[PDB]
Structure formats: C-alpha cells, structure tokens
Design a binder for this molecule. Structure first.
Ligand code: GNP
Ligand code: CA
Ligand code: MG
Ligand code: MG
Ligand code: MG
Length: 166
C-alpha cells in the first residue's frame, strides 16, 4: 500500500496536535501540552485506495525552530495551520511556507492552508483573507475544528489528494 508522509506545522497553540489526535484517535484534547515532535501512523482508505498516513506533529514553540529543516526535508505534504482567532498565527504562515519552499527547492510543494478553531466566535481572520493567501500559493484553504471534528478529515484527505497531483 501507498504511504503518505504528512507534516503538520504552524504557530504555538493553533491546534496542530488537537487536529492530528482528532483525526487519528477520534477525541478532542482540551488541555494544552506544547509539543516537541510526535509521530502518528494509521491505515485508512481514501478514494478507494488503502494507504498509510504517517503524520508528524511538530512544535509551534519558536524555541524548537531548529528542528524544522529536518522534518521539512522528509515530509511529502504540509498542513499549514493557523487559528481563526489568532491573527498573528495567520501572519506566521508565510515564514513556514517560505522555509518549506526553500528546503524543497520548490514553489510546488503539496500543501493545504488550514484555518482551525472555526467553532470559536472570536474570529479575527476572515475566510476571504485566508482564501486570498491560499490562492497566491496555489493551494486549497479549508476551515477546521479539532473540537467538533468539522473539516478535520477534509483537511487531511485533501492534503493526500494534493500530494497525488504532484
Ligand atoms: N475551541 C477549540 N479549541 C481548540 C481547537 N484546537 C485546539 N484547541 C485548543 O487549543 C489549545 C492548544 O491546542 P494544541 O493542539 O495543543 O496546539 P498546538 O498547535 O499543537 N501547540 P504546540 O505548537 O505548542 O504543540 C488546547 O487547549 C486545545 O484544546 C479547536 O479547533 N477549537
Ligand atoms: Ca478531552
Ligand atoms: Mg502540539
Ligand atoms: Mg481584520
Ligand atoms: Mg490545485
């Protein structure tokens, strides 16, 4: 079966772990335990194809920015996550996409822009603003909530479908 190497990146606290754990383990992590670097692996059927998702849940704490080059090298596709109630996390996306872009020496790396926490009402990043960013990258924008499960499968499966276009 086909393996897909996914990597989840974004600022601290945007919900990278919560999203990954919701996808893989089907529950919502309420508490906030900052991540160093964890791996998750799960066999799933996507569009009729049995495949193995290998997902690297990375650190948003800038203290660990040194580890980015390593995982950006190995990853096949990147879930670039910000929170819709965290304007700064949205502005931070560019610096993640720039690094991925450099490391893969490519303007063409399978990526999905994800606006997480869409269950919360304190929105400061409007859908249209994120759509414009994703458009400029030539990638999809998808809103998610790790809490309600909204968009969670859509985000990760879309990332698989982007890798397949590569
Ligand atoms: N309401 C709501 N809270 C969320 C959502 N996703 C994450 N959170 C909350 O936000 C906090 C941080 O989540 P977490 O997944 O740990 O973020 P992270 O991006 O993995 N952090 P780090 O970069 O430090 O590893 C937690 O309290 C978590 O419950 C979401 O979709 N909705
Ligand atoms: Ca819980
Ligand atoms: Mg985390
Ligand atoms: Mg505004
Ligand atoms: Mg496309």
């Amino acid at each position: 079966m086909t393996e897909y190497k996914l990597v989840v990146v974004g600022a601290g606290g945007v919900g990278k772990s919560a999203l990954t754990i919701q996808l893989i383990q089907n529950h919502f992590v309420d508490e906030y335990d900052p991540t160093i670097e964890d791996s998750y692996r799960k066999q799933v059927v996507i569009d009729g194809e049995t495949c193995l998702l290998d997902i690297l849940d990375t650190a948003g704490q800038e203290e660990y920015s040194a580890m980015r080059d390593q995982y950006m090298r190995t990853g096949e596709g990147f879930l670039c996550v910000f929170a819709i109630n965290n304007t700064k996390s949205f502005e931070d996306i560019h610096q993640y996409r720039e690094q991925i872009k450099r490391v893969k020496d490519s303007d063409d790396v399978p990526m999905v822009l994800v606006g997480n926490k869409c269950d919360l009402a304190a929105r400061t990043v409007e859908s249209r603003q994120a759509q414009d960013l994703a458009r400029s990258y030539g990638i999809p924008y998808i809103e998610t909530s790790a809490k309600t499960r909204q968009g969670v499968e859509d985000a990760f499966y879309t990332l698989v479908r982007e890798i397949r276009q590569h």
